[PDB]
């Protein structure tokens, strides 16, 4: 009620405070409990092999130098006072670019409790690196992790734990990913040994399953239809050389344009993927159809009966071979 | 008139002022009234699912520690004095990259009133996230919101309201979006409960309706014309096998090129859209036209009468079926 | 020449100086005279609807607190002293991202005069928004403005004027825009009334006119040539059905590819422009040519004389109709 | 060797030092000698009309206030001391975005000398604007300059010179430009008069010559080959009307695709270029070949002798006219 | 255990500490031992000729002014204390844009030892320049280096060495590059003489070998198949002029589209590469095939026997010549 008394108490708390020394310096490690409230997952980039994530990151510890008595309330202080306290050197092991939002003020919260407990919250947009195995793309399932670690203090100076157990991370169910669906999320706590000692480590893992409907409608169906159109030339009479030659070579041209424009639209991932295998299979099928017609045209004059036999065998074989190829592809990648 | 007297008054106001404590700390919550003057909406991006917004954001509160007497004027102070006062920890819940303009100085205004009232203005360019339902794109109607919330203080320490009621937000009528048109805007005030307590929340919602003339001219009309050209082969005499094969396969090639280049130009939206369904329908129609010609050519030799009957039935059916498809499409999505 | 005396004078000037109070606080408004030296105009973006401008922006005013005697020279101080003086809160109304150059030092200049006059110069690069009416693109004329206003002070506290009258802006003649030409520039001074009062406003307007030679050589000539090639099929004998079908459908394919690649290369402007109308007109012309040939081929067998009459009428009509279309287009848009 | 004595000497030097006043304030101008060690030229952009340049920029002047005695050594101080010293307000006239590297510390060097001489080095990555005349692109020769000027001080307060004469700028020979070769570089020193007085100016000019092999292999040879393939139709007998029509129209289509995709790959420059003229010439040649074939096909029935004469004249003329066009092109632009 | 005693000791250490003077100023050079722990290599860019590298950079030196007694423990201090100590002016000679991570705090570590030893850790994401020889692309092998040098201090003031010998740099084996493979890494230490004297230099070099499977699947196989299709016209009977003309010209069109789209997808590298040579070889082969067919068609009427002889000679020559071309290409570059 008396603002002067509160100011006196806060000044007494910050008088003689040393920000260069951790709580219980030279004593037991200070336990820091962390919770994450995930606001959104902005994007998942395969080209950059990373993902953007916005979250409310809250740390909870206890500095007895900040214990105050006579005020039966929790002091929610201005965020600028965070520049005058000790805060954990928490960082994100696999991030590439992170920042704290600073509009209208720096998105930061300091709340002190009578027993010296400090709650310290930030709003962070971090671009965390996520190595992806795109061999089964676009039927792939990825696993992206956020790693949280102390930078300077070892496990003899600091310890990390998830505050609230498995309920430490919230907001996962509200994440809207246009292309993925979050199958599961896991929380792990452990210690990692490096040349400078043992460091606490927290891990938050998401498992994402890609949605395939867009690719099915826009990447496979045109190729299937072009392959069927390539088959069409089998029923065309072989006397009309121009018609069948034009049909085959134009199907080849359409397949090439489809492949090039899909490769332009699809992310630039320099190795073999499932969709690339399917496109190569379709291209090989149309190439074989054109080559078969060329052979039929060449051997037609010598023996037209054998030409007709080869034509009907192609009619009965090419759809069957393509059905087998599709069955193998959709059973190997599913 | 006496600048020395005014300097003395300001120094007296700022002497003993604790910026770490909110006004009336430990008492009733401080009421903050907010108004927004929207300068422009820079862009709306479906790829990033966001919109850029430049605005003048003004907050109004009362701090009795700043009440001054003897000066019958409102003191417009230099913006730098804002670093020596308590300001609310207002932030935008759904933004992604917000900044305050800083040329030639930080675009910030502090005005003090004799009764302790503070007016605090900022010029903010915020890129706010907006989830978009693009199932009906480009005939879609989006709803994009700006959420305003206190970061640290709860409803026991701060309260938000729209100063001026429904006239708090201005400049909406002057917004010039090249692709959208603001149908309506709304103001909402409420409280949101989180694990740390109840927080005030203001919401500014816009409803945007997309313009369709560009898409009609540049995306649908070419497809309709190519479909009509595909029908053209029905009136061509069947004996000219080369001409009909060339026409059908070249219509297919044009349709594929159109689809690929539109997909390249269209925003990267990894799910089915209405325009995609329409393009797939046109592609299926030209594919069926080519298949029908193939069937006619195959059965022409055995019984030309049946071939002619199929040709005339195709002439009478394909325009009819395409008209039905267009009617269904333009009644479902409108 | 005695640097100790000058240091004493400057320290006396800055001793007791209050940066939070404008000159003549509580008295007459302080007049600020502004001059702009435009170094360059970097770019004019149609997609983003803005232009980038680099300029030496200089503000001239009088602060009697800074008047000094005994030194018959103008004191060009280090720019850092600007952090210890009151400066106008000048900002740009329509800018989107401005910055002050800071290599090797902050590109800032402070000069003091014996009568208390302050000259304050900055080197600023600003991306100012400019809504463009691209209906007549690429034959359009744009009017892009830079607006200058006081953020916090009203006309009761500050007044703006163009120092030097019509010669307050220089370097316009030296601007090298590869695509536009600066027809004219104008200086406007006025006052703008908002809910918080009246504010001074300066406006510098440029009238840019686009150059059309590149569009003529790259965007219209290919379409005209493809239309002529479509006309070519008229003189081809109707017996060669395959030849005319291939010519017409391949002209259609070339027109589609040209349109798609031009749309990819042209700025993404989501509404109809003149060039789009021209491309659609050419597309309709080639479509009608193919339809006419189809009708001729259909009616050739029943009555070849009527088919030949239609063919020669097409030969005499299509160039004439295209000439009329071009005349209407080039007189409506010029 | 006695660090306390050196610290005392430095403190005495900085005691009473006024950074707001230049050396010899009110007296003769302070001469600043500059040298540049060019680390690399990162890129040269025609689209943005600029070039990125990383360099070690060193300034050399004398400040008698910093003269020290008793230490016969050059004091290489920590870079932060530069914040406590007067440094020239040197800036780059034509830069767009410059920064000083700051990892692991700000790349800045202060070296004091017994006679008061100060050496001040920075590592700067500057994006300098360069207007390019791309009429003769890609056979062009550009001249790109870096301008160095004093922002606030005139020639009465400061003077510039290249320290070391023509050897002031080093590292030019080690520059590896993938697309350009540095023919020459020049150093210029002068004075430029603006409305505020005369300012010293240094200029460093490079003359860049573009490599042509990539364009010859990738831009001209395909066009020449497509033109030759267009000529191929002349030797084809006119009885096969479909074959010649297909050949001509497909050569036209290939030319259109080549032009559009080259324009996509070529930098976005909105005016005429030499490569554009060459592509238009090739397009006109193939267009005229198709027109000639159409005329031959039209007049073939009435009088085959004249048709064959026109065909052989085309055979003997088209290569000759194309050779003349290439000779004119390669003599005018070289 | 006594925090007051530790605070007293630290304050005593920093009392009278001059950060402007290196350790042992005026005496022997201070030896700085460095170790790098590489976290990941983000990307390797052929367009920009640079690679992004994230690492933990640790420096080790001895400052006797920081030696403390009575505390038999190492002091891991808050990173902010790094602003109150001397640190080496280490920078990266070839970087273009580097930063130290700053979430949640600045990613920085200071550890002090009783004998005056300082360990200084940073987390740095640097984009280092790497000039690449893309003549043998995509069969190329690259050598990319990270250079480390002192900015202001010469070898008389500071010396660099790798702390740990060849084990100083760790994490190389765990680097995951999708496109490259790290063959070897080398650590070099030396001294480099500039005009201002000799500076210490450390170098960390990587040798990277590009993976070729993606290019074999998606860049070479389509060209080989298109060349084979161009051959297939040889077996087509030469009486069918339209079919062979269509096949040859459409193979040319597909080759052009493949080349243009690959050039668009491939990095912008404006000089000759191996893949460009292969594509030009395939283009020349299909062009020669079309020319040979044209010659056969021209000479067919005068003497069909010679035409058939040329046809069969082409059948036996073109595959052999292409096999020789492939053998030369794949033996020269491998
Ligand atoms: C994405 O991929 C990552 C790996 O790259 C997966 O992360 C792994 O997740 C599993 C759990 O699903 C982790 O396994 C667990 O590790 C715990 C920590 O081990 C450390 O600490 C213990 C002491 O507490 C030490 O003994 C140990 O040596 C380590 O130092 C263990 O405590 C867990 O054990 C518990 O469960 C097992 C059964 O699983 C029982 O047998 C045990 O008794 C005990 O109850 C467990 O082993 C694994 O460590 C994680 N790896 C990494 C590298 O972090 C993600 O799960 C994946 N994404 C998704 C969504 O799954
Ligand atoms: C884009 O989409 C969003 C939703 O995603 C829309 O936002 C909703 O807008 C509606 C109004 O159109 C909001 O409904 C209103 O909420 C007010 C607040 O209620 C809260 O606070 C009160 C106390 O003040 C509590 O009692 C209550 O439980 C809530 O916690 C109400 O005060 C409003 O009441 C009005 O209607 C009721 C009848 O429904 C009457 O009885 C009242 O007298 C009064 O007239 C109303 O219910 C809704 O809350 C918004 N949702 C969210 C999540 O914010 C946007 O409107 C939409 N964009 C556009 C342009 O429409
Ligand atoms: C790009 O488009 C903008 C508009 O969006 C154009 O800006 C307008 O420019 C014209 C001049 O070309 C401006 O007109 C002038 O306004 C002055 C200011 O008027 C205010 O202040 C006066 C008092 O000083 C009040 O009376 C008045 O109500 C306003 O509050 C006037 O002083 C000018 O009057 C003088 O000239 C006119 C003739 O032009 C004479 O008849 C008068 O007697 C007098 O001599 C004049 O009216 C206009 O205000 C600008 N509008 C805006 C919104 O800024 C740009 O010109 C255009 N770009 C280019 C290159 O033209
Ligand atoms: C890229 O393009 C730029 C221009 O945009 C070229 O820069 C020009 O370079 C030439 C030299 O090659 C410069 O010409 C020289 O200017 C010197 C300075 O003149 C000023 O100072 C003198 C007094 O010292 C005044 O009299 C004069 O009015 C100026 O105020 C002169 O001193 C030079 O004269 C000397 O050389 C000439 C021969 O070159 C002799 O005839 C003289 O007797 C004397 O010895 C000379 O005139 C020119 O100023 C530069 N222009 C600009 C705008 O800076 C670059 O060279 C070009 N890039 C490349 C690679 O060439
Ligand atoms: C990418 O490309 C760079 C070059 O651009 C390669 O870097 C070179 O690496 C080699 C080693 O592979 C270096 O060669 C060695 O240099 C050492 C340092 O020499 C300097 O310092 C000494 C004093 O210590 C001076 O006398 C000397 O003049 C230099 O200033 C030498 O000490 C080494 O010699 C030792 O080994 C050789 C055998 O290898 C013995 O014959 C000698 O007697 C002695 O024992 C050796 O010469 C070379 O300096 C590096 N050059 C540069 C510019 O850095 C990278 O290796 C390459 N990347 C990869 C992965 O290989
Ligand atoms: C509030 O506390 C201060 C400091 O103890 C004291 O001086 C002041 O009198 C108190 N206020 C009241 C109303 O007692
Ligand atoms: C202006 O105020 C100062 C400070 O209160 C005072 O000393 C001075 O006398 C005042 N001026 C006048 C004219 O009263
Ligand atoms: C310079 O001015 C100072 C302050 O007035 C004075 O103490 C000093 O003696 C002057 N120097 C000379 C040379 O007059
Ligand atoms: C801790 O150190 C301080 C400062 O030296 C001293 O005053 C205090 O007595 C010490 N604590 C104990 C328990 O001795
Ligand atoms: N070069 C001194 C600053 C300047 C030039 N032009 C206008 N202001
Ligand atoms: Cl932000
Ligand atoms: Cl800005
Ligand atoms: Cl800058
Ligand atoms: Cl940097
Ligand atoms: Cl970061």
Breaks (C-N over 2.5 A) in chain C follow: none
Q: Which residues of chain A neighbour B96 with C-beta distances below 8 Å?
A: 42, 54, 125
D64 in contact with ligand 4, CB cutoff 6 A = no
Question: How far does chain E reach from its first CA to its final CA, in angstroms?
Answer: 66
Largest CA distance in chain D: 111
Across B306-315, b (16+ Cβ under 10 Å) vs e yields ebeebbeebe
Write the residue in D104, D225, D258 that is nearest to E260 by C-beta: D258
A4 in contact with ligand 6, CB cutoff 6 A = yes
Cβ count near E334 (within 10 Å)? 8
Token pair belonging to A85: 């306290």
Secondary structure (H, E, C), chain C: CCHHHHHHHHHHHHCCCCCCCCCCCCCCCEEEEEEEEEEEEEEEECCCCEEEEEEEEEEEEECHHHCCCCCCCCEEECHHHHHHCCCCCEEECCEEEEEECCCECCCEEEEECCCCEEEEEEEEEEEEECCCCHHHCCCCEEEEEEEEEECCCCCCCEEEEECCHHHCEECCCCCCCCCEEEEEEEEEEEEEEECCEEEEEEEEEEEEEECCHHHHHHHHHHHHHHHHHHHHCCCCCCCCHHHHHHHHHHHHHHHHHHHHHHHHHCCCCCCCCHHHHHHHHHHHHHHHHHHHHHHHHHHHCCCHHHHHHHHHHHHHHHHHHHHHHHHHHHHHCC
**Fold match between domain D3-210 and domain D213-332:** no
On whether D161 is known to bind a ligand per the annotation, the reply is: no
Interface test with E, best of A26, A83, A102, A276 (most E CBs within 10 A): A26
- Classified as helix, coil or strand, E51 is strand
The interface residues of chain E toward chain D in range 133-192, judged by CB-CB distance below 8 A, are 151-154, 157
Distance CA B180, CA B137 (A): 12
Question: How far does chain D reach from its first CA to its final CA, in angstroms?
Answer: 66
Ligand 4, residue D143: give the atom nearest the CA.
1
Write the residue in B107, B211, B261 that is nearest to C91 by C-beta: B107
> For residue D272, which of D158, D148, D173, D135 has the smallest C-alpha distance?
D135
Feature table: binding site of B for 4-aminobutanoate: 91, 149, 151, 196
Q: Determine contact, residues D6/E26, Cβ cutoff 8 Å.
A: yes
Distance CA D144, CA D50 (A): 8
Nearest CA to ligand 9 atom 14: E2
Size of the B and C interface in Cβ pairs below 8 Å: 179
Please name the residue that has the structure tokens 């190569």.
A280
Q: Are residues B110 and C152, on separate chains, in Cβ contact within 8 Å?
A: yes
* C-alpha C188 to ligand 3 mean position (Å): 6
On whether A250 is known to bind a ligand per the annotation, the reply is: no
Q: Which residues of chain C neighbour B43 with C-beta distances below 8 Å?
A: 48
Q: Are residues C87 and B105, on separate chains, in Cβ contact within 8 Å?
A: yes
Handedness of CA C125, C131, C137, C139 (dihedral sign): negative
Q: How many degrees, rounded to 5, is the angle at CA B28 between CA B23 and CA B30? A: 45
Assigned CATH class of C213-332: mainly alpha
Runs of H (alpha helix) within chain E: 3-14, 213-215, 221-232, 241-265, 274-300, 304-332
- Which ligand approaches the C-alpha of residue A8 most closely? 6
| DSSP secondary structure letter of residue E27 | S
* C-alpha D107 to ligand 5 mean position (Å): 27
Distance CA E322, CA A299 (A): 25
Distance CA A57, CA B116 (A): 35
* C-alpha D102 to ligand 14 mean position (Å): 5
- Classified as helix, coil or strand, D209 is strand
What are the phi and psi torsion angles at A19 (to 5°)? -80, -15
Which one is the CATH code of D3-210: 3.40.190.10, 3.40.50.1820, 2.70.170.10, 1.10.3720.10? 2.70.170.10
Distance CA A143, CA A209 (A): 9
Size of chain D in residues: 334
> For residue C233, which of C215, C220, C245 has the smallest C-alpha distance?
C245
Q: Is C308 on the interface with D (CB under 8 A)?
A: no
Distance CA B105, CA B123 (A): 11
Q: Determine contact, residues A267/A276, Cβ cutoff 8 Å.
A: no
Distance CA E128, CA D54 (A): 13
Distance CA D48, CA C43 (A): 8
Token pair belonging to A164: 């609230």
| DSSP secondary structure letter of residue A116 | S
Handedness of CA B159, B160, B163, B167 (dihedral sign): negative
On whether A92 is known to bind a ligand per the annotation, the reply is: no
Feature table: binding site of B for histamine: 91, 150-151, 196
Q: Are residues C104 and D93, on separate chains, in Cβ contact within 8 Å?
A: no
| DSSP secondary structure letter of residue E170 | B
Interface test with A, best of B256, B278, B292 (most A CBs within 10 A): B256
Residue C8 makes CB contacts below 8 A (sequence gap 6+) with: none
Structural domain boundaries in chain A = 3-210, 213-332
Please name the residue that has the structure tokens 């065309």.
A236
Ligand 1, residue A203: give the atom nearest the CA.
54
Q: Determine contact, residues C74/C102, Cβ cutoff 8 Å.
A: no
Residue A235 makes CB contacts below 8 A (sequence gap 6+) with: A315, B294, B295, B297, B298
Distance CA A267, CA E334 (A): 29
Write the residue in D152, D256, D264 that is nearest to C79 by C-beta: D152
C171 in contact with ligand 10, CB cutoff 6 A = no
> For residue A52, which of A100, A97, A107 has the smallest C-alpha distance?
A97
The interface residues of chain A toward chain E in range 200-239, judged by CB-CB distance below 8 A, are none
Secondary structure (H, E, C), chain B: CCHHHHHHHHHHHHCCCCCCCCCCCCCCCEEEEEEEEEEEEEEEECCCCEEEEEEEEEEEEECHHHCCCCCCCCEEECHHHHHHCCCCCEEECCEEEEEECCCECCCEEEEECCCCEEEEEEEEEEEEECCCCHHHCCCCEEEEEEEEEECCCCCCCEEEEECCHHHCEECCCCCCCCCEEEEEEEEEEEEEEECCEEEEEEEEEEEEEECCHHHHHHHHHHHHHHHHHHHHCCCCCCCCHHHHHHHHHHHHHHHHHHHHHHHHHCCCCCCCCHHHHHHHHHHHHHHHHHHHHHHHHHHHCCCHHHHHHHHHHHHHHHHHHHHHHHHHHHHHCC
Pocket mutation for ligand 1, best pick of A161, A205, A207, A209 (most atoms within 8 Å of C-beta) = A205
Range list of β-strands (E), D7-153? 30-45, 50-62, 75-77, 90-92, 95-100, 108-112, 117-129, 141-150
What are the phi and psi torsion angles at A146 (to 5°)? -115, 120
Ligand 5, residue E186: give the atom nearest the CA.
60
Q: Which residues of chain B neighbour A7 with C-beta distances below 8 Å?
A: 18, 20-21
Q: Could you tell me which residues are beta bridge partners of residue C119? A: C60, C111
Q: E strand or H helix at A169, and its extent? A: strand A169-170
- Classified as helix, coil or strand, A304 is helix
Q: Determine contact, residues A85/A23, Cβ cutoff 8 Å.
A: no
Q: How many degrees, rounded to 5, is the angle at CA D329 between CA D327 and CA D331? A: 65
On whether E120 is known to bind a ligand per the annotation, the reply is: no
Ligand 6, residue A2: give the atom nearest the CA.
1
Interface test with A, best of E232, E233, E240, E250 (most A CBs within 10 A): E232
> For residue E234, which of A234, A298, A238, A239 has the smallest C-alpha distance?
A298
- Which ligand approaches the C-alpha of residue A92 most closely? 15
Interface test with D, best of E151, E293, E300 (most D CBs within 10 A): E151
Token pair belonging to E285: 């082969």
Ligand 10, residue D152: give the atom nearest the CA.
2
Token pair belonging to B60: 């109004």
> For residue B215, which of B144, B318, B133, B136 has the smallest C-alpha distance?
B136
- Which ligand approaches the C-alpha of residue B100 most closely? 12
Tell me: cis bond preceding B37? Omega within 30 of 0 counts: no
What's this structure's resolution in Å? 2.9
Residue D184 CB-density burial (10 A; 0-12 exposed, 13-18 middle, 19+ buried): exposed
Q: Which residues of chain C neighbour B42 with C-beta distances below 8 Å?
A: 96, 129
Nearest CA to ligand 4 atom 22: D190
On whether E149 is known to bind a ligand per the annotation, the reply is: yes
| DSSP secondary structure letter of residue D151 | S
Q: Could you tell me which residues are beta bridge partners of residue A198? A: A193
Q: Which residue of E has its CA nearest to D245?
A: E242
Distance CA C95, CA C127 (A): 6
Nearest CA to ligand 5 atom 33: E188
D151 in contact with ligand 10, CB cutoff 6 A = yes
Q: Are residues C42 and D129, on separate chains, in Cβ contact within 8 Å?
A: yes
Ligand 5, residue E184: give the atom nearest the CA.
60
- β-strand pairing of C75-77 with C108-112: antiparallel
Largest CA distance in chain A: 111
Q: How far is CA D326 from CA A20, D219, D262, D275, D278, in A?
A: 76, 14, 19, 12, 8
Q: Which residues of chain D neighbour C126 with C-beta distances below 8 Å?
A: none
Breaks (C-N over 2.5 A) in chain D follow: none
């Amino acid at each position: 009620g008396n603002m002067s008394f509160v100011k006196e108490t806060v000044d007494k708390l910050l008088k003689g405070y040393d920000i260069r020394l951790r709580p219980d310096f030279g004593g037991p490690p200070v336990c820091v409990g962390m919770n994450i409230d995930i606001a959104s997952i902005d994007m998942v980039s395969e080209v950059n092999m990373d993902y953007t994530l916005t979250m409310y990151f809250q740390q909870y510890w206890r500095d007895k130098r900040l214990a105050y008595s006579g005020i039966p309330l929790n002091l929610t202080l201005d965020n600028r006072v965070a520049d005058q306290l000790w805060v954990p050197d928490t960082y994100f092991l696999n991030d590439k670019k992170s920042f704290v939002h600073g509009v209208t003020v720096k998105n930061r919260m300091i709340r002190l409790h009578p027993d010296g407990t400090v709650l310290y919250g930030l709003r962070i947009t971090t671009t965390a690196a996520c190595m992806m195995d795109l061999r089964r793309y676009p039927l792939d399932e990825q696993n992206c992790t956020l790693e949280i670690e102390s930078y300077g203090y070892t496990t003899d100076d600091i310890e990390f734990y998830w505050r609230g157990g498995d309920k430490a991370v919230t907001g996962v169910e509200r994440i809207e990913l246009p292309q993925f669906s979050i199958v599961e999320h896991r929380l792990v706590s452990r210690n990692v040994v490096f040349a400078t000692g043992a460091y606490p480590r927290l891990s938050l893992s998401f498992r994402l399953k890609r949605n395939i409907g867009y690719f099915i409608l826009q990447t496979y169906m045109p190729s299937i239809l072009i392959t069927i159109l390539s088959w069409v030339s089998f029923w065309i009479n072989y006397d009309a050389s121009a018609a069948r030659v034009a049909l085959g070579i134009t199907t080849v041209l359409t397949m090439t344009t489809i492949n090039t424009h899909l490769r332009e639209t699809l992310p630039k991932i320099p190795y073999v993927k499932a969709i690339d295998m399917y496109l190569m299979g379709c291209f090989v099928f149309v190439f074989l159809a054109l080559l078969e017609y060329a052979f039929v045209n060449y051997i037609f004059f010598s023996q037209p009966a054998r030409a007709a036999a080869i034509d009907r065998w192609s009619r009965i074989v090419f759809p069957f071979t393509f059905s087998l190829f599709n069955l193998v592809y959709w059973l190997y990648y599913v």
